[PDB]
């Protein structure tokens, strides 16, 4: 197979500049590369092909160029409804037909602390048998932030599956819920909890134990 | 306007058989080459298989090859792909794409169209409503700063809930988080909601949990602790 | 100047193997012929057609 | 079982090059060469890798008769051809015909 | 064009295709490439390269001096010289105005004579193996690795060793 | 002719078909017709009078007074200037004779081409579903209602819309 | 060639037939022969013909004495007079060079696209009755005695008087 290459996977950028995504080849694929821009929860939508030629319907502000090994895609003013994944294509040799991996486009704004909000095992849970403790983080940038649960000291390297949403449309903010699942009969067997925070904003060490 | 809709996704067991198949409208479908794309929840896109206008040409994934059977009727404008022998690693998103026409490939990328896809999800766990959980505001934060309550839904199968708040009343500041599957093969999320934090004790918060497959439907009040 | 040519032109000489030229039709030695044309281009390769209408 | 495609095609590249046809202009072609030469080096050089006898200010006439404004140019013993300039004027200084003039600038002309 | 195939029933040229100037593309299970026609290539380029040169070569001048200088009393045959210098003008631009707009429809329509026969090869050697699915291409009745592919544009094509498999996959497909 | 179709395995012109060069001629239920097909009788008179422009524009002179006056002792000069005179004639009567020769063959084949690719076209499209029955003409083993007549004529014939029918009919008759 | 008949599908000439420019070679149970189109010849005799009476008899001169003399003092008109003979040389040998090249491949295309059509005509009149089996030759799925062969060479072959026979020998030998 021809190997298609998009670092970097996230870039950060203000709305209405120039952004360049990249894409390269194991080997030459002349001029047979396509991009494409995919948005959550919505199919896959053409932008360039032959590596240059744009698609019709598709605003001037997107453009392409490169041959053999090396190509790269260009959004001139980048508008708010152009944050999306974006990923190539080649079509010169296949099958198999390869894409690559992805390059996410991300709003950047200034840096947002985040608002730790930690939840206790609801009593009517504590009658079926399990209990989960919720450690909310609200309205952070950027996206790289740790989390981990402090019980009585435990570093639990398991358990605690951790998701995000997307950026909002207004603040273009993340939040983060890690979720700690455990069950009765090693629940009550501690009463001391702490959830925990690395993230900017909150640079300094944390905000919660 | 092209339009590709694809249809047959659903729920199998490891090692069943499944049948997607696609419509396709607004062109002459009896000219251009056919290819199925998947995407695993959270991942890229991975190409499935191809069918050429006339069927002689079928070309498949490695990872896919020896299960799959991709094949056309071009007479009822329908693609078609057959899944056997479905393991955990297929669930994913097909989607239905359009390529070149017969003698033009290459001339454009062989998906120029894409449908809105399918949902696939091979798992052995059963379809099952959700619990629901509350997350009782904390009584020991400010008098002036805001507060935030949620619902917990937990253990539900297979995708997707949908969350909303006083029966849609409450929008601004609710983060509906994207589920997690939990090692025992079933889903879970958290929707919490931002409040100032004056407002607990003359107003109530209920959350609206709708699970689809299961039937489901309840309501549940996060009031503050006592003691 | 110091330089060499074998066709000279009261405006500078031409160094050429092709068969016109449209410097000047007053020359010395051995020229091409003297044309009132502004472009003779002969084609070599194909037509070049490297994309087609979207169908 | 049943199998795959084999196509015949032709080359295209980014050339814009364009030609004139009998039944069609502007054709632009993968490849083409230049049969007219419009391009010159701005000089007077050597022909047969002989240089020309430059009078300057002077005429055929003023050389050749010995005009006291060309006794400072060089006397060389062979050139390929003769230039003049459009204001080159210095002559037959005492007004006179010089008696089959063109014809003798012809004889001297190499 | 003349031949029907540049521009006619091949719509387009390859980009991908830098080796040569008529060629073949194939894809199979292996994958897919473009690869020129070596020979036919070869013979185009022999044949421009003389058209060219021959164009050149057979002017051959000789050492001239196109200038002449008449005194005042000499006007007629100053412009018996003019009239020479004016035909000669004439007839060398009308002719190289021409014979550039001649050839260039004739190399235009000989790379299209040449891409209609390396066509006709394909197609004489395959028969009932391949079917004609338009656009200058060949869909086979039967699977054809890369060594296969090699054959065809090798013009060292076995029909019979294919044949039979090729007929059972054509008779059911047509039932 | 050059190109075999004129004059050859299709013996004779229309005089029924004035709108344009090349066409069609079709019969069915409804009744016959005959219609040009504009795409290449456009193509053709945009090429042939471009052809013409060509020979007459690439000719462009300056203002020239032929004729010299020589008294009794400039004998030698005045047959001099007879030869220039006599030189240009000879030159441009023989390339007029020959370029008007050459052209009008090439534009003879040029129509000769653009008959021979016409037909090509639609027996492309046709395939198995009609039958060359000679003279450029194709029976289709299917009715062919002036709709369909009109995809052929416009390019747009759908093969498999009748390919089982003309199957059908193809394969009893051959029974 | 142009139309890839002569060194093209048809790799080699017949030293074995010696009264015609085209034709055919056939062999049956009572033998084999060579055979020369006389139409198709006959009518290329006629086309070059014409061909080389054009290229010579529109070069029609008049009575003409080319030299001039001059004295010691006349060196300008001499020269005049060499540039005169010099622009004429040239002219003539750059257009006479060039036409016998141009013309020269014209000629070798008319020839191949008469191979060319020939082979088709007759494509056309065996239809199923007869294989392609390369290189110009037909094998036909029935005996064809010296007779049925002189319907090919003229033209007048009769395709259902041998179609059925032809068909069942055909369907057996692909079964
Ligand atoms: C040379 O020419 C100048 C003007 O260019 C004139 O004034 C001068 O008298 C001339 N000298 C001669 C002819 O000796
Ligand atoms: C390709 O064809 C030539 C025909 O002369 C033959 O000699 C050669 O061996 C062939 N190539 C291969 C790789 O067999
Ligand atoms: C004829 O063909 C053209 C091809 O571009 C198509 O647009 C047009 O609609 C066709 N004519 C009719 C009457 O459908
Ligand atoms: C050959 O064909 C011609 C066609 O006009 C026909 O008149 C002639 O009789 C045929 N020859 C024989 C021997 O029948």
Redesign the interface.
């Known amino acids: 197979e021809i190997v298609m290459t998009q670092s970097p996977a996230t870039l950060s950028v203000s709305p209405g500049e120039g952004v360049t995504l990249s894409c390269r080849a194991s080997q030459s694929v002349?001029?047979?590369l396509?991009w494409?821009q995919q948005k959550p929860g919505?199919?896959?939508?053409?932008l360039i092909?032959?590596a240059s030629?744009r698609?019709?319907g598709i605003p001037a502000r997107f453009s392409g160029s490169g041959s053999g090994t090396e190509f790269t895609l260009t959004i001139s003013s980048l508008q708010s409804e152009d944050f999306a994944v974006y990923?190539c294509?080649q079509?010169?040799?296949?099958?198999?037909?390869?894409?690559?991996?992805?390059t996410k486009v991300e709003i950047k704004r200034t840096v947002a602390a985040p608002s730790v909000?930690?939840?206790?095992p609801?009593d009517?849970?504590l009658k079926?048998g399990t209990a989960?403790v919720?450690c909310?983080l609200?309205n952070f940038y950027p996206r790289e932030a740790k989390v981990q649960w402090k019980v009585d000291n435990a570093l639990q390297s398991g358990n605690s599956?951790?998701?995000?949403?997307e950026q909002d449309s207004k603040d273009s903010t993340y939040?983060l819920?890690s979720?700690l699942?455990l069950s009765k009969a090693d629940y009550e067997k501690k009463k001391v909890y702490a959830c925990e925070v690395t993230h900017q904003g909150s640079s300094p060490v944390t905000k919660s134990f | 306007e092209v339009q590709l809709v694809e249809s047959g996704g659903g729920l199998v067991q490891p090692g069943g058989s499944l049948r997607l198949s696609c419509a396709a409208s607004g062109f002459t479908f009896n000219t251009y080459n056919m290819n199925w794309v998947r995407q695993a929840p959270g991942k890229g896109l991975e190409w499935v298989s191809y069918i050429s206008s006339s069927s002689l040409s079928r070309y498949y994934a490695d990872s896919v090859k020896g299960r799959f059977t991709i094949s056309r009727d071009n007479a009822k404008n329908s693609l078609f792909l057959q899944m056997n022998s479905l393991r955990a690693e297929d669930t994913a998103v097909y989607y239905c794409a359009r390529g070149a026409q017969a003698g033009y490939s290459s001339f454009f990328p062989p998906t120029t169209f894409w449908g809105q896809g399918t949902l696939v999800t091979v798992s052995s766990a059963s379809t099952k409503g959700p619990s629901v959980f509350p997350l009782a505001p904390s009584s020991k934060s400010t008098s002036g700063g805001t507060a935030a309550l949620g619902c917990l839904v937990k253990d539900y199968f297979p995708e997707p809930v949908t969350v909303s708040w006083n029966s849609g009343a409450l929008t601004s500041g609710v983060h509906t988080f994207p589920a997690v599957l939990q090692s025992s093969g079933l889903y879970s999320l958290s929707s919490v909601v931002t409040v100032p934090s004056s407002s607990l004790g003359t107003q109530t918060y209920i959350c609206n949990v709708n699970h689809k497959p299961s039937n489901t439907k309840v309501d549940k009040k996060v009031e503050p602790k006592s003691c | 100047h110091d330089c060499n040519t074998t066709c000279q032109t009261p405006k500078g000489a031409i160094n050429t193997s092709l068969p016109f030229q449209n410097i000047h039709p007053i020359t010395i030695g051995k020229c091409p012929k003297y044309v009132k044309s502004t472009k003779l281009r002969l084609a070599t390769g194909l037509r070049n057609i490297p994309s087609i209408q979207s169908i | 079982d049943p199998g795959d495609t084999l196509c015949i095609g032709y080359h295209a590249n980014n050339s814009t090059d364009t030609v004139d046809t009998v039944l069609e202009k502007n054709v632009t072609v993968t490849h083409s060469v230049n049969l007219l030469e419009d391009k010159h080096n701005g000089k007077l050089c050597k022909l047969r890798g002989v240089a020309p006898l430059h009078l300057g200010k002077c005429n055929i006439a003023g050389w050749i008769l010995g005009n006291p404004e060309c006794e400072s140019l060089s006397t060389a013993s062979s050139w390929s051809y003769i230039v003049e300039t459009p204001s080159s004027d210095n002559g037959t200084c005492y007004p006179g015909d010089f008696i089959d003039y063109e014809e003798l600038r012809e004889q001297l002309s190499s | 064009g003349l031949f029907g195939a540049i521009a006619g029933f091949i719509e387009g040229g390859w980009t991908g295709m830098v080796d040569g100037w008529y060629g073949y593309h194939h894809q199979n299970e292996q994958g897919s490439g473009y690869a020129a026609d070596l020979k036919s290539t070869q013979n185009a380029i022999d044949g421009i390269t003389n058209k060219v040169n021959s164009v050149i070569e057979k002017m051959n001048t000789q050492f001239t001096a196109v200038g002449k200088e008449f005194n005042h009393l000499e006007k007629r045959i100053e412009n018996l010289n003019k009239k020479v210098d004016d035909g000669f003008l004439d007839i060398w631009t009308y002719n190289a105005e021409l014979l550039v707009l001649l050839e260039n429809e004739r190399t235009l329509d000989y790379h299209d004579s040449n891409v209609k026969n390396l066509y006709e090869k394909v197609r004489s050697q395959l028969k009932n193996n391949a079917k004609e699915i338009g656009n200058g291409c060949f869909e086979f009745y039967h699977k054809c690795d890369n060594t296969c592919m090699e054959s065809v544009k090798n013009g060292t094509y076995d029909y019979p060793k294919y044949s039979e498999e090729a007929k059972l996959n054509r008779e059911e497909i047509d039932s």
């Not at chain 1, 909000?117 to 206790?120: L, Y």
């Open positions: 002349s001029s047979n396509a494409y919505q199919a896959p939508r053409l092909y032959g030629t698609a019709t990923y294509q079509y010169y040799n296949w099958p198999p037909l390869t894409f690559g991996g992805g909000f930690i939840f206790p609801s009517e849970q079926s989960s919720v909310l609200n599956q951790e998701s995000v949403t939040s819920s979720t699942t």
